[PDB]
């Protein structure tokens, strides 16, 4: 466990139907395992890229990634820096945050995210995302509106079937309807990076997108079942994966990406969507917006 | 001190000799360049497309290395031109603790493509 980039949420673990309790998790200081100059971010968002290459993701030739929460405290973005090196070269990424930053991303729009629009698909979204004014440990713990309303909506609208997503939660920061929506994945998690072993953080991860059912998830429910977990598995923090970077890079896959009508996407197809082997969407000039 | 050193050079005519003038006085170099995670057997050139960082260099994004991207103002290339942002760059260890001064004050052989009296030839 401690070499592997993290730890992701166990089947055993998804398929219980627990009440929701409190975490009882903490995170004191500070980063024990960062090596000496580097970021955490950078080192979560390493974490992250090499716990997908361990799955299924579909690359095509001309990529599209588009990242929320790129921005910082720092008035840089260390996650975009990551997705730069792993991503393929050419491939086109584009960042955003409520807050002004400066990036090495193709195009970076500043505003809320809901500011964002877009008529393109993408092939990959990734979300760190997070309300610094949301209160630690409280009263309760609801579902969360705000930035994952909007997410929700731009994944059922803008991602490419057979696209991935990877979206920052924790204890208190999450929402029912973007787990109801994990299960539209061929294979969804649950990721947990070993160098913020000790935060409430993890990653949703979905694989391959369906654009429709494919299980029934309750996202209260799943939350409560996520918190359990966490609760009953510590997990000690780990930088062991750092020290190897030889196979970072995303693979290049070359994967297909097709145009095709509903009636046109079969069962042979689908089977290409859950592999992933194809991606469907438009190749269209792809233009961005924030406005207004 | 970072929000006063990005400032005291944004409103400089010449940011570049701001930030000299700056250091030299005993201010602190500019800090979160974003340092990469890397294998350190790159070709060690400059400015690349990824992190090519030798056994004697560190990549950094390449941005956050850019004192005119950090202060948000006007670069001094002819047009609309950063030759940092998007790529990364490799920067001496020896002088990893002010990789925005580094980049200011060397220059990249056009030939080796590695910095000027820092591996070039
Ligand atoms: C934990 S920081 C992300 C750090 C960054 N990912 C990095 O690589 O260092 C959370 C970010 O989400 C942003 N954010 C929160 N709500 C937002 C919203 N509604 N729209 C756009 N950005 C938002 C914040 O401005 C903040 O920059
Ligand atoms: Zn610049
Ligand atoms: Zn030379």
């Known amino acids: ?292 | 001190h970072n929000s006063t050193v990005l400032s005291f050079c944004a409103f400089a005519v010449d940011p570049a000799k701001a930030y000299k003038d700056y250091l030299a006085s005993g201010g602190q170099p500019i800090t979160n360049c974003v340092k990469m995670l890397c294998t350190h057997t790159g070709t060690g050139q400059a400015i690349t497309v990824t992190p090519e960082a030798n056994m004697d260099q560190e990549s950094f994004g390449g941005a956050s290395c850019c004192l005119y991207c950090r202060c948000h103002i006007d670069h001094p290339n002819p047009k609309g031109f950063c030759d940092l942002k998007g790529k990364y760059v490799q920067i001496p260890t020896t002088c990893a603790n002010d990789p925005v001064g580094f980049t200011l004050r060397n220059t990249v052989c056009t030939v080796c493509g590695m910095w000027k009296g820092y591996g070039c030839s």
């Open chain 1, 1 to 292: 466990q401690a070499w592997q980039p993290g730890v992701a949420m166990p089947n055993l673990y998804k398929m219980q139907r627990m009440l929701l309790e409190k975490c009882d998790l903490q995170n004191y200081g500070e980063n024990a395992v960062i090596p000496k100059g580097i970021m955490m971010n950078v080192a979560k968002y390493t974490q992250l890229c090499q716990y997908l290459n361990t799955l299924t993701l579909a690359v095509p030739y001309n990529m599209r990634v588009i990242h929320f929460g790129a921005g910082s405290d720092k008035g840089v973005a260390p996650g975009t820096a990551v997705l730069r090196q792993w991503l393929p070269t050419g491939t086109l990424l584009v960042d955003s945050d409520l807050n002004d930053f400066v990036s090495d991303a193709d195009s970076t729009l500043i505003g809320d995210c809901a500011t964002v629009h877009t008529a393109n698909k993408w092939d990959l979204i990734i979300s760190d995302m997070y309300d610094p004014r949301t209160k630690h440990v409280t009263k309760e713990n609801d579902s969360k509106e705000g930035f994952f309303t909007y997410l929700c909506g731009f994944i059922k609208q803008k991602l490419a079937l057979g696209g991935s997503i990877a979206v920052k939660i924790t204890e208190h920061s999450w929402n029912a309807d973007l787990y109801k929506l994990m299960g539209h994945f061929s294979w969804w998690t649950a990721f947990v990076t070993n160098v913020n072993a000790s935060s409430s953080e993890a990653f949703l991860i979905g694989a391959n997108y369906l654009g429709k059912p494919k299980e029934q998830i309750d996202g209260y429910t799943m939350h409560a079942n996520y918190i359990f977990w966490r609760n009953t598995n510590p997990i000690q923090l780990s930088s062991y994966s750092l020290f190897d970077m030889s196979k970072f890079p995303l693979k290049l896959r070359g994967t297909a990406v097709m145009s095709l009508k509903e009636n046109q996407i079969n069962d042979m197809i689908y089977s290409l969507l859950e592999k992933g082997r194809l991606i469907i969407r438009e190749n269209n000039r792809v233009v961005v917006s924030s406005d207004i």
